[PDB]
Design a protein around this ligand. Structure first.
Ligand SMILES: [Mg+2]
Lengths: 251, 443, 288
């Protein structure tokens, strides 16, 4: 089976990944330019982290040198149009104007885990695989790239997570073909979550899933619809529910 | 133990009927018109053709029969190569092909191939280890043919080849081997002695064709193959015993040695004109695409001129002892005159793209990178423009202003991101931003 | 029984490498490659790299291949760095005393401490296609088509779009198999789908096909090209050349256009109740 994780996360003005010219990385989608965070940054951000340090694990999930890793991380994409900005700075002497680039955007992240590959890499152990899945979920929920963080303390937390158990891999990037336009009676994160909701309201009409928002701040579906099997307001409870569905293990 | 280039199969070809095959030199000359040379790397596709051209020159010199167009290759060429069967041998105690006497400088056989890491090179994109994986006989032959054309400096105490830094290589293309041989047949009055003959001598000044085309800057031995059941690390063919180690010594190039390559492109000062591609965008460079416009002013004014056909360009970027990239291209040329100013402007376009990139969004600042978003859209526009390369070179229906249109949509898309406001000032700024285009600079 | 199977390749980013990538510069092809599609099918079925070369790649090599470019993406470049803050592996090893032993014999004596590392940072640039869609039709035996469709219904391993960082945006088995005589009819059968009501739509769709030999002989035409993408092995990689032709289909006469069939903009709910609706008066009277 395959476990798919979708995350929606808003970040404060920062520069978490830049190119050789110092500008934030970008991509092209929906006929517009969007902000991008590289996959090999989110990986090595989740990896090599102190929090994640909780049959050798950390290699079965992410391989090294025919290990056949069981974790797949995609490229983070923005739900709106990119808005790069330039900051003009000078250096004092206490005894020449330079420019830097920064941006702020809301990102959609996609992760996939193959359960059978994880079990086979662990040589039949099944409790260790569940512990690794829980640890990876906790680490991915509470980790950010260590870019220009000393000048841009961007330590925001995700505002919505969806865990799915589909038969085939598929990403919901097509829910963001039209860039999000902010209206007075809503905000950016709410509109992004509504756009996501109006992509699983379809498809089924024309599997199960667990939805998590902090203290039920943003509920999936702008109605009393059953598009989500369970709505959970705690991260540990979400981990426990996923652990139970994996085959009934205790966190 | 015993291996001959005339009998054993080492030449990878594809027949015009659609069947890939690996045949020998004798059969390659026999058919020569129902097949094309098939190689993934342009380097081998170039050196094998150069070797075939040199062999044809030798056969014509010693037989006095030229290859007629739209016909099989001359028959009398085949017996002559049969007589000189002792000069094409890869092993044994005697005369060796493109080799010399043994030495004590032992090196694994991986420095003959540029793309496979060796010694201090980092093995990330190709997992290899010295004296563990080797090459087959065909790959050894294909790597011995790269010495005269694609040899770079070795750092301290080791020089380059006869052509110094490997420059661009421009020739003519055809749909069959005989056609390609017949479109680049121009011989000289002085031929010299080829390297595959008896011991080559620098002797006096002047070089000729056969000696220059087969210059050997290094001495190599190719010890022996060791039994095993591994696979070649260059082609991947599941095979038998391979070679693992050899001996390499450096041959300096004497001063003087007046030589002009039939295919190389030179600058105004006589230096080699090489590709200018890099993996990064520094203060004096902007990464766009293959630089197909560089060896055009020199070629269409010094050697080759205007001629209807297909121009094949091979470019190999390098920096000291480090390899960067290789690419190739084919341009359809009709041969309709030339304009000096326009060709010179076309030959200098990287500077124009850099100048376009370096312009800041507003103001003038020293040491400013300048609008990095334009560099993200430049490669796509360059790729779109490169389709009409033949018409842009000769100015038939394509012009600089015609190619300037491809940037409009991308700049319009970028302007929305750069000025995300719904005011009059933002719209005026977007209108000003849309009208950016490179400017031709001739010097 | 159906003789052809369809694959849809769509995503935010995808890459199909070309033969002109032998260094840190990795470029991509304009259309999906035969080797990539065959590797995707092998991964879906569940054959490893060392087993595909034995009686699984030759079987799939006989299938005819054709790709229809619905919408082409934009070429984008990514700056990649490797090994910053760590040490990279080198290939340098001590020369042996005698040439008698090399390869497997010397590999048995390899130790973890014998390897050598250096502190450095590898730089590279990699090419991707942004916002591109492709339709692939594979034609051949009906039993093989049925097996491939069944495997594609539920994949054994994760499937991507040439690189593991490129997950699909639409299901790969969206279009069921059918029966057709030629590749052109099969490619014209599947319609063309829009994403929102007002968007540019290509007037002409390019198509890249394999070249059928026809009768015995029939040398390849003058517009045929050579692509080095016929798989023979996956470990180590080995590719063979093939002949490829290009054609086109004009929309509106041979390829149809589908409707939106969905809602893009979310928008909030509905306030502003009506004071003239009969239901409002009924409930107001009841409340009174
Ligand atoms: Mg080989």
């Amino acid at each position: 089976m395959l476990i798919e994780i979708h995350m929606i996360q808003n970040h404060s003005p920062a520069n978490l990944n830049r190119d050789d010219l110092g500008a934030p990385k970008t991509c092209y989608f929906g006929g517009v330019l969007r902000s991008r965070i590289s996959s090999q940054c989110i990986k090595r951000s989740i990896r090599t982290s102190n929090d994640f340090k909780a049959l050798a694990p950390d290699i079965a999930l992410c391989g090294r040198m025919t290990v056949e890793a069981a974790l797949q991380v995609a490229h983070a994409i923005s739900t709106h149009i990119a808005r790069p900005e330039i900051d003009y700075f000078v250096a004092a002497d206490d005894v020449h104007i330079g420019e830097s680039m920064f941006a702020s955007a809301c990102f959609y992240k996609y992760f996939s885990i193959d359960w059978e590959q994880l079990v086979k890499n662990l040589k039949g152990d099944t409790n260790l695989a569940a512990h690794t899945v829980g640890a990876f979920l906790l680490a991915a929920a509470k980790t950010n790239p260590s870019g220009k963080q000393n000048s841009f303390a961007a330590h925001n937390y995700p505002d919505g997570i969806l865990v799915e158990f589909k038969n085939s891999p598929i990403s919901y990037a097509n829910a963001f073909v039209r860039p999000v336009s902010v209206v007075k009676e809503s905000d950016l994160v709410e509109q992004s979550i509504g756009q996501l909701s109006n992509y699983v309201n379809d498809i089924r009409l024309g599997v199960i899933g667990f939805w998590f928002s902090p203290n039920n701040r943003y509920p999936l579906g702008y109605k009393h619809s059953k598009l989500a099997s369970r709505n959970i307001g705690n991260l540990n409870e979400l981990v426990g529910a996923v652990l139970d569905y994996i085959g009934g293990f205790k966190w | 133990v015993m291996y001959n280039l005339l009998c054993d199969n080492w030449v990878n070809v594809v027949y015009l009927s659609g069947k890939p095959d690996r045949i020998s030199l004798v059969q390659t000359l026999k058919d020569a018109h129902c097949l094309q040379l098939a190689y993934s790397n342009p380097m081998d596709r170039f050196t094998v053709f150069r070797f075939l051209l040199a062999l044809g020159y030798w056969c014509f010199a010693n037989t006095n029969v030229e290859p007629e167009p739209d016909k099989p290759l001359p028959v009398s060429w085949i017996p002559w190569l049969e007589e000189n069967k002792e000069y094409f041998e890869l092993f044994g105690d005697g005369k060796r092909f493109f080799q010399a006497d043994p030495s004590s400088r032992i090196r694994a056989i991986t420095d003959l191939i540029h793309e496979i890491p060796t010694a201090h090179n980092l093995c990330h994109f190709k997992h290899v280890t010295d004296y563990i994986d080797g090459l087959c006989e065909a790959c050894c032959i294909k790597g011995l043919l790269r010495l005269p054309v694609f040899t770079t400096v070795g750092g301290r105490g080791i020089g380059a080849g006869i052509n110094n830094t490997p420059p661009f290589y421009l020739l003519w293309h055809a749909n069959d081997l005989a056609g390609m041989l017949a479109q680049n047949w121009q011989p000289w009055d002085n031929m010299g002695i080829p390297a595959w003959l008896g011991s080559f001598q620098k002797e006096s000044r002047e070089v000729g064709l056969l000696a220059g085309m087969t210059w050997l800057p290094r001495k190599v031995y190719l010890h022996d193959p060791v039994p095993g059941q591994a696979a070649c690390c260059s082609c991947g063919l599941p095979s038998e015993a391979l070679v693992y180690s050899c001996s390499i010594e450096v041959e300096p190039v004497p001063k003087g040695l007046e030589w002009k390559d039939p295919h190389g492109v030179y600058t105004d000062q006589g230096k080699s004109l090489q590709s200018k591609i890099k993996l990064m965008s520094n203060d004096r460079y902007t990464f766009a695409d293959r630089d197909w416009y560089s060896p055009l002013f020199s070629y269409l004014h010094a050697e080759g001129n205007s001629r209807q056909g297909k121009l094949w360009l091979v470019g190999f970027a390098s920096d000291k002892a480090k390899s960067i990239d290789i690419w190739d291209k084919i341009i359809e040329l009709e041969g309709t005159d030339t304009n000096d100013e326009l060709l010179a402007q076309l030959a200098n376009r990287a500077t124009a793209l850099n100048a376009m990139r370096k312009k800041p969004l507003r103001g003038d600042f020293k040491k400013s990178v300048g609008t990095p978003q334009i560099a993200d859209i430049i490669p796509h526009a360059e790729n779109r423009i490169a389709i009409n390369a033949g018409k842009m070179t000769e100015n038939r229906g394509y012009s600089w202003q015609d190619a300037d249109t491809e940037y409009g949509e991308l700049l319009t898309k970028v302007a929305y991101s750069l000025e995300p406001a719904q005011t009059v000032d933002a719209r005026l700024k977007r209108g000003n931003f849309i009208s950016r285009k490179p400017w031709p600079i001739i010097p | 029984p159906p003789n052809t199977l369809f694959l849809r390749l769509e995503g935010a980013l995808q890459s199909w490498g070309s033969n002109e990538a032998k260094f840190a510069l990795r470029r991509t092809a304009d259309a999906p490659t035969k080797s990539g599609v065959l590797g995707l099918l092998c991964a879906a079925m569940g054959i490893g790299r060392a087993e595909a070369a034995d009686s699984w790649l030759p079987k799939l090599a006989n299938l005819r291949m054709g790709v229809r470019i619905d919408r082409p993406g934009i070429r984008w470049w990514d700056f990649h760095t490797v090994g910053a803050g760590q040490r990279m592996r080198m290939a340098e090893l001590k020369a042996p005393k005698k040439p008698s032993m090399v390869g497997a014999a010397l590999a048995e004596t390899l130790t973890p401490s014998k390897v050598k590392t250096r502190a450095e940072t590898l730089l590279s640039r990699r090419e991707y296609l942004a916002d591109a869609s492709f339709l692939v039709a594979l034609q051949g035996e009906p039993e093989l088509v049925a097996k491939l469709s069944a495997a594609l219904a539920k994949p054994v391993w994760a499937i991507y779009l040439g690189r593991k960082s490129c997950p699909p945006s639409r299901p790969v088995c969206e279009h069921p198999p059918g029966f057709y005589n030629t590749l052109e009819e099969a490619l014209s059968a599947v319609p063309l789908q829009k994403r929102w009501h007002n968007e540019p739509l290509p007037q002409i769709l390019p198509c890249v096909m394999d070249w059928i030999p026809g009768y015995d002989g029939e040398h390849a035409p003058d517009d045929a090209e050579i692509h080095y993408d016929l798989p023979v092995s996956f470990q180590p990689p080995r590719h063979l050349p093939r002949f490829v032709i290009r054609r086109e289909l004009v929309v509106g006469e041979d390829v149809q256009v589908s409707r939106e069939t969905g809602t893009s903009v979310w928008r909030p709910k509905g306030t502003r109740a009506d004071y003239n609706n009969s239901e409002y008066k009924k409930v107001r009277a009841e409340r009174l």
